[PDB]
Amino acid sequence: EKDTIAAEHKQEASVLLNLHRNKINYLIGETMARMTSLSIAIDRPVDIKKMQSILEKTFDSEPRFSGLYFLNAKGDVTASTTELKTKVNLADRSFFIKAKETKKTVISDSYSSRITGQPIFTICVPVLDSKRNVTDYLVAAIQIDYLKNLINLLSPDVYIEVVNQDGKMIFASGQASHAEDQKPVSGYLDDISWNMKVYPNPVTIE
Amino acid sequence: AEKEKDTIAAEHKQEASVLLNLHRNKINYLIGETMARMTSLSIAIDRPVDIKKMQSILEKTFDSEPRFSGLYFLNAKGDVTASTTELKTKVNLADRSFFIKAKETKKTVISDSYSSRITGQPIFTICVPVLDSKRNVTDYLVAAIQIDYLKNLINLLSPDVYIEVVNQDGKMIFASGQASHAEDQKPVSGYLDDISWNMKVYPNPVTIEE
């Protein structure tokens, strides 16, 4: 019968899945690339005043970001796009610990910014000296809400879910009613363990 | 019946759409990330630029990135002052359309493809003007990408499909696969994001099996 319109509704969902993952994968990889390039280009030893201006310039007009920060070896925030009320320290963060040990870039899961209270995930790049000692950290915090609006903006009338590897809702876009009786086409992102589920839309009057 | 040729054909077409999206994204990513890298460099450098430091930055950026033909820094005149490629002569690029537009627009430029003056290979470039305080263009970052790197990426993923990339003038940028696989097919087509190349993915025909 109209299994025909269903199968097509399904491949549309698949097409959407790849579009949206590609977008977010792109956003994450691009940010990583920006940070990596900053680390390479800035005169060493890092001058804090210069870093401060660079983060401001980079942060400027990129709703992508919750904030951009720079940390010292101890994990104190020493440069920041958000005016900081008190001293802030992120050495307790999972991504900080991992970044310190691996001396490699780290992407975090969603949490609530100590600095803004908003939900975010971060990209954290260790800055190394000549002897490959980790001395500082670039920290790029992305607003989860930006990703949500990004997806919503393109697929407002499909229901999509983003869930981490443990079932925690990262976010959803669109009306859940659309998912009734639908199995989702789904897949994980590249650099972060978030699973995206796109529900095909129902077969309607035709 | 004959209606099941239609059925298979439709799947072939769909697969063509799938490849169009997959392959465009790979190129869009390359271009976008390169723009982002170049822009971050332009912001992070301390004026007045030390050309030896710049040379070092470009080498480190270039290292292990088959994507790149080369990376270059230009003075305000278009002279190449730093180069990942061993230059045998002075090189000036001020005559390039991308240079002229970068200078005039004071914004990032993604060029059409052409034959590199430096390596003789097909390339296209990402050019980012470096501004001073009064927003005067003082220098240029230039990232030259190998067309053939893009062609070989695609051909290696989709060896059995014929795919064309073409500019607005109708110039073939590159093709991949055997043109014969396209006989009696309209391609599925679409543009890249940052440069107006159009990619055409041809559906494979319905074989005997069936």
Separation CA A196–CA B209 (nearest Å): 36
DSSP string for chain A = -THHHHHHHHHHHHHHHHHHHHHHHHHHHHHHHHHHHHHHHSPSSPPHHHHHHHHHHHHTT-TTEEEEEEEETT-BEEEESSPPSS--B-TTSHHHHHHHHH-S-EE---EE-TTTSSEEEEEEEEEE-TT--EEEEEEEEEEHHHHHHHHHHH-TTSEEEEEETTS-EEEEES-GGGGTT-PPEEEE-SSS-EEEEEEPPPP---
Residue A138 CA: distances (Å) to CA of A16, A89, A135, B47: 33, 13, 11, 22
Q: Using a CB-CB distance cutoff of 8 angstroms, which residues of chain A are in contact with residue B44?
A: 37-38, 40-42, 54
Tell me whether residues A34 and B44 touch, CB distance under 8 A.
no
Burial of A112 (0-12, 13-18, 19+ CB in 10 A): exposed
Burial pattern A55-71, b for ≥16 Cβ within 10 A else e, equals bebbbeeeebbbbbbbb
The answer to whether the CB of A160 falls within 8 A of the CB of A150 is no
The answer to whether the CB of A202 falls within 8 A of the CB of A5 is no
Expressed in Å, this structure's resolution amounts to 2.3
Angle between helices A3-41 and B51-62 (to 10 degrees): 150
Please check whether residue B55 touches A, CB under 8 A: no
Separation CA B159–CA B179 (nearest Å): 11
Residue A117 CA: distances (Å) to CA of A84, A101, A143, B86: 13, 27, 11, 51
Separation CA B66–CA B124 (nearest Å): 14
Domains of chain B, each with CATH number or no CATH: 12-47+147-202 (3.30.450.20), 48-146 (3.30.450.20)
Q: Using a CB-CB distance cutoff of 8 angstroms, which residues of chain B are in contact with residue A41?
A: 40-41, 44-45, 57
Could you say which of A19, A37, A50 has the minimum Cβ distance to residue B40?
Answer: A37
Q: Using a CB-CB distance cutoff of 8 angstroms, which residues of chain A are in contact with residue B57?
A: 40-41
The DSSP element (H or E) to which B6 belongs, if any, is: helix B3-44
Contacts of B82 (CB under 8 A, 6+ apart): B51, B54, B55, B58, B72, B73
| B51, amino acid identity | I
Q: Which two tokens stand for residue A41?
A: 């280009």
